[PDB]
């Protein structure tokens, strides 16, 4: 039994941008089955997660359909998931052949290569397909860990 009341009262949301329908119709219309997501973006990646926006995260990491119906919930975590010595605990893929599909999972650690012939991680033209974010606490408002 949903309530939709703990999201409108508080104002600690970074970007409360709904898509598909309005926020007022979410309390009256029934829903058959809801699906939630959980991921941490590198601050300036919230604008890329939109039905029509592109970049480096909404192409082969988390694809959003153009006819999506929901709401974006983002909030800062500069004190909950931040470390002054280093937060090397989150990575992201930046090398993959072709874009992904909406709501896909690509959990893998195989090396990246343009053609076939799977190479080894130690090579000259083959590198790791993932890279750590590197969240800090003494940076600007752009490089901050936001949970969307």
């Amino acid at each position, epitope marked *: 039994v949903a309530d939709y009341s703990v999201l409108y009262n508080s104002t600690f949301f970074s970007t409360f941008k709904c898509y598909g329908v309005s926020a007022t119709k979410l309390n009256d219309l029934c829903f058959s*089955n809801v699906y939630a997501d959980s991921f941490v973006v590198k601050g300036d990646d919230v604008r890329q997660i939109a039905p029509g926006q592109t970049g480096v995260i909404a192409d082969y990491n988390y694809k959003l359909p153009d006819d999506f119906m929901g709401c974006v919930l983002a909030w800062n975590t500069r004190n909950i998931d931040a470390t002054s010595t280093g937060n090397y605990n989150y990575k992201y893929r930046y090398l993959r052949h072709g874009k992904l*599909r909406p*709501f896909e999972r690509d959990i893998s650690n195989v090396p990246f290569s343009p053609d076939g012939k799977p190479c080894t991680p130690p090579a000259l033209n083959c590198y790791w397909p993932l890279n750590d974010y590197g969240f800090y606490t003494t940076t600007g408002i752009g490089y901050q860990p936001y949970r969307v």
Partner: antibody
Amino acid sequence: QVQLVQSGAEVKKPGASVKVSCKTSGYTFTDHYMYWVRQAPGQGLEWMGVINPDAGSVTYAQKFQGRVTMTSDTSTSTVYMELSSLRSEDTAVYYCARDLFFIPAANSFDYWGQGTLVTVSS
Amino acid sequence: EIVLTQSPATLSLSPGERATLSCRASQSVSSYLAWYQQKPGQAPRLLIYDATNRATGIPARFSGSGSGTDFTLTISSLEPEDFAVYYCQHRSNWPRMFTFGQGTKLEIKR
């Protein structure tokens, strides 16, 4: 490779119920929209027939609302269609196709089955 | 529901030319159109989804277009194994609806 194997032919009396299955294999059958179509001889197919395998949500068309009832099985990974009140204009080949997107999204058909010839006569 | 109307409904051309398949809707719908390719006797096959992206396994000779209410399918080079009936599917947004057209036969000109 993704492939959908169906049953063979099945003749049914004009007024009984038909039970046609759609076996899927080759992929993780947990988050994928399943559809159903049937091309009539000379005419075409126009209805959604989308059923959620994971959840228990079903969707039917306007002309076929209380005549068709579908169900899914997360254990055997095979959906079942139950169309009651068989008419003389529904005797055609029934197909079941998957979706290109996942459950939250929706797209066109990408993987088709093989066909199930259903006939309603003597 | 949005109905699909096909005025030509037929296209008799020779292998090597370009196709002029059309798919027009009733109202001013979005670009959520997807064509198909169903060989007579075999199972249907997806050709172009969302009217702006190429499907998997489809060669480079197939390239669709269209925006809003003027959609068309232009084939680069016709192949003898590509002569079949093509259906376009239109999808709605809110009530998870999907509508199909009528189909256009493509017979080899002789």
